[PDB]
Symmetry: T
Subunit: 145 residues, 12 copies
């Protein structure tokens, strides 16, 4: 049983600019936490980040061939824009949970719309890095009850 | 340190109709799980459910006088309709997390709008009863780091 | 207790506020007519009015426990605003007919939208008090063909 | 005293296609039941169906010269498209009740709009063929109190 | 034959209902006036009215074969609904003037939209029967300068 | 009872002056009511006051006003201005003329606050003038009822 | 002045920019034709043009004191922007006809909307200068009927 | 009889105006090509054209009684306006392919909406007369694999 | 000099037409009342009315150089159209109260939008001339300790 | 080289998931059929698929330098999102036909809008793999006789 | 004048209010810079500012009679509201460049729309006073290459 | 690199080749001009073009690590579609100026919306290649006053 965590564009910047501005937490820190959590449950977990939509689509297609059972995805800005991503997830038919670090509803009106949310199992937003850890918890329970 | 869990209208019906339809889980089951989780962390947790918007608003006002530090609220249908509830939460200035059992983005278009989400710390939807636990876990960390 | 007739807010004013405007007919007159009609068919009929949304939602929940088979509802202003009501009717899964005394389509544009109509069996509007009798006639035929 | 019942396009198909899914009831059956109801009250009742809008408009004009006192109209698909029909009914100034077999609010969004309903005495939808009878019962009461 | 006047649905009702309500003027009166006005200028003028959109479209096609140089059209309700009419006028490439007796901008908001106006040479509305006369005067001047 | 003027305060207005009286000020709902009652007494007009967080209670109070011979309602519906058709239908149903009041400027806030189910049926509206808006409404009402 | 003709901004440019775009016809030519036409009917006709909305509003006020019985107005660009003009015409309660040289429906979408048309007796557009004469003809018949 | 080709209003004009500039190809030419194509596959093919919506709706009804298996329809302007047509095709339940000679997406925004396209098997637009042949080829393969 | 009262276009017409219909009150009456009220508090009050937006903008600029502390403005029609006015008031940074005699919300939908209201201290509408007095009362309180 | 066939994102999944779900046909099968069809007409045909928008844009730029005369494109999800793709096709000025396997009008509303369709020669949707063959057939005719 | 610089309403306020707030730069300073820049290229340059729309329309008309070859215009608030200005510039057919000191896209949503931008040669916004110099530079190059 | 110039998709096509231009100017010409201009001011300038959004995003991230002080960006089509780009520029917090060669407001309505403009210092459009030079001039002034 395999779980894949996908991080969308710009998330690589976490913790890089003036770690007093938006905090010290990095993408690598998040991935480490998740890997450890998954190891504790004897679940294999892979992670992927890219700024390039095509790479993310290719990565989803590959997940199908690897037997991935569930995707945890923070599509970042692609949530609002990418029908290709939606069609990738639906095309491979791997269930997914959508996660955002920040509360997208508290920001500009264009951020209120998603091409993924309605097909997700569920969505977590605004709880920071712990959102990913919750999604993973849910996923573990669902894969190994 | 006190946490208040508020459940909105119709959530009292959980598990009542044909427990083969939408499942066996009851509101009372959810509350018992949360109370046990909070007790494990030595946090006092209250719960409240009502079908009446006024009762909910009155309960939020009371929370201010009780020193409640965080509200976990499943407003159910009121998320789409109640400005009064938004003004109650902002008026008492108690931070809150919004929770839904089901994925509201997968339903009718009118369910995509919330008078609360933009002012929440964050939102969890579609993860069933575990969403409330995740919220509680976040809240515990935040109140007692 | 077989058929339940629900009247929403302000309908208690019928026949009170100048017999000039909308005539001499009262809510109590309507209920009497309906009770007699139901008695003629050996059907038990209960009636309920409230200005309070929560009271109506509670009444609907009670109906499920009483074995009510069909609801005839004039939600009055709540037709345009109450998702809670929709969710109550759907949550107890009692079929309903929506009734309005007046022709809502002939009034302000905000009255053209309903949170109920699309889930009703059907809708009668603009036929005065007879609209409740027609609904009842339909309901009787359906319950006892 | 005369009543005219008008049926719009495609209603001639009722009961024709696979009567065991869309039902058995025909347009002629509806007419029979209305005629009988009218004959019981000693009211002359005419009926008309066409798939051509022009024929319907012409029929309405003829109704004016015949002294028709009330029109019961199921415009079917015309309700969403025909201003000409609205203008015919207003031009002759014969009051009308609008009827649909099916619940149009439960169907596609474009079916939610009507060029007639705001000018109708009232509207009945979703109650099957009994909606025409209810309309007729109202009309009889109104013409002969 | 040189000029064709087309009247749309319901205009045959002019002057029929309580000639004290909306006046004594008939369609026939208007046609007589326009015929005389055309004769004065040695222009052959034809007229047509119908409640059936197909008959109008056919008439427009016939105009092309008759060498009609300009159409004066009061499409009545069809202005708001008929793309077929728009396409018939464009398809035969005969220039037209749109006329309405009443001020359509003063009525319901749906009457503010036309499938013809943008392709007309011009539009006259709200000037009663004289509007047709004005249109004819323009058309005469244009055809014989 | 009979009250010639009824003042109605919608949900959350009971919170006025309660949270950190340095944040949104010291003025309380009770202070507003006392000012209005003194103003009305000065004109020999009977005034009643009502606040609730429950929409049904407000509707019930409006119905009760009819039976008490109330001649004008001064109403701050607060959040219900944007959501309550029931409130509109209560006021229209009893046919008591009303003036709509808001302490804050609603036009300066979120876009959903720009829409009201009441304003178009009000005699008029006062917003953004704080507690004085109620007094002005009351002054207008007094003039209209006793010219 | 019994009839007042108002021309809005930019109409002073008619005939100035190239013998060809709107052709050789000038504002002064139009005014001379109208004056001659009105003289033929023994009607006093004044004219006014300005680029300044305030000057037009002022001129409409002055019309009320002069006993003007009808206004013929080409508001030009002000039709789409000026509520003040609407309120001036309604405030003095002088009936008016709206005229445009060009067919405003054939142009950009923002030209489709008028703050005047719905309060005009009627509207003439796209018939060039003759549109003003037609309006004048109508006005003459209406005043000396 | 097995396949019915329906052409909507104005399509009879094809090839009639100044063929050397506006196209030589005629509706009759299109029909003759399709008839030959169908004969080659031993499929019986009927054709129909009308400017009258009712004629088309009647024709579609008659198709059901003739055992037509598939309709190829160019509704022309009716595609944007006619619910009646949509309801006729759905009411007889005969699958259809929608064809347009021109590319409708390249024209006015109102031409981007169809009351048929969503219920068609598929749509071909902008390929001229070959679009019909392609539809026919698909239809032949589907009926006789 | 301390308080400036600005009246927008058309307000000069108050009391001028058929005083019985819109009443006897004039703009001069209003100005006299307000002058007397200000004199009673020892405040200097100036007044200005114009039909010309540029005059109003110029007036506001002058107010800055005269030390005006507060503007009471009835922009009339300009409220719905004039960004220039908004930018004048903001540019001079003089606080203002917006006043309307009539209830703008009770009128056409375009009157519901303001380019001023959101930057006003507050707004008074529908209370007739007394609205200007109330605004003045508020201003006096605010300016004097 | 003379014709280029472009497939957008996720089309590489065709036939891969449970060939009983959405069928056995693969992208390669489609390509083979088209290559054979082009060879029959002595036309060179190239094919290209990618999940990455930038690859597609680069491929289109390359086409210009290879003398490609026509593009047959299935942009898949990119049709709804990619202005870059539109600008590539218009920038190299190679005419194109848009193809879709499925009927996009039968799906979610966001799939009804295209950044390509209005600039395509034409569009084929919902006819499965044969849509590409039809497009190719048209293209051959157009390039050759 | 070869080049005319037009400043719209409220731009006379630049540098007047607390030159520490929005800076020390004045309208006169800008005009001086531009006049010097034009003198260096031997181009005659005029400037104009007004708070009155009519004055600006009159000044554009006067520019035509002075042989002005290009206009550089900062319409300020009039860019969102003035069709009269658009029609003045198009009517005299003098090409123009639109300039704004501030970035209008960064402000309220109503500032995102312009009645001039789509007919300008180009637009510069947000570069402060230098935007006028850049426009002038471009204009110089275009007039004297 | 002190200043980075970024060019979006399809701009590589400029000039000879022609995106359909009467014009010889290339992307390389533009870059040469800008490099020479920057060298004249002793500023280091880098340039980048790509048809791949991910490449651009990566390049913006790299700019942060290189100490780039200001970005001049012509996002071309991405301006309308890419939230990832907006988030990249905001995430690295490098100020930017948005440039377009053509006047985007003069084109299709979808080109009127930008995900960047509101966060840019400013915008230049429609001034051709000089727009970049202007931006560069501004930037130089700002970085070295």
């Amino acid at each position: 049983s395999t779980i894949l965590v996908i991080h969308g564009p710009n998330l690589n910047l976490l913790g890089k600019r003036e770690p007093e501005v938006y905090g010290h937490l990095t993408l690598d820190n998040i991935n480490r936490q998740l890997i450890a959590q998954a190891e504790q449950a004897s679940i294999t977990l892979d992670t992927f980040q890219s700024n390039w939509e095509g790479a993310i689509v290719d990565r989803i297609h590959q997940a199908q061939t690897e037997g991935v059972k569930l995707i945890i995805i923070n599509p970042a800005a692609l949530t609002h824009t990418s029908v290709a991503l939606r069609d990738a997830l639906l095309g491979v038919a791997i269930p997914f949970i959508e996660v955002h670090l920040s509360n997208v509803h508290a920001r500009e009106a264009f951020r209120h719309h998603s091409y993924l949310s309605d097909k997700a199992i569920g969505v977590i937003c605004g709880l920071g890095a712990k959102g990913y850890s919750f999604a993973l918890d849910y996923a573990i329970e669902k894969i190994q009850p």
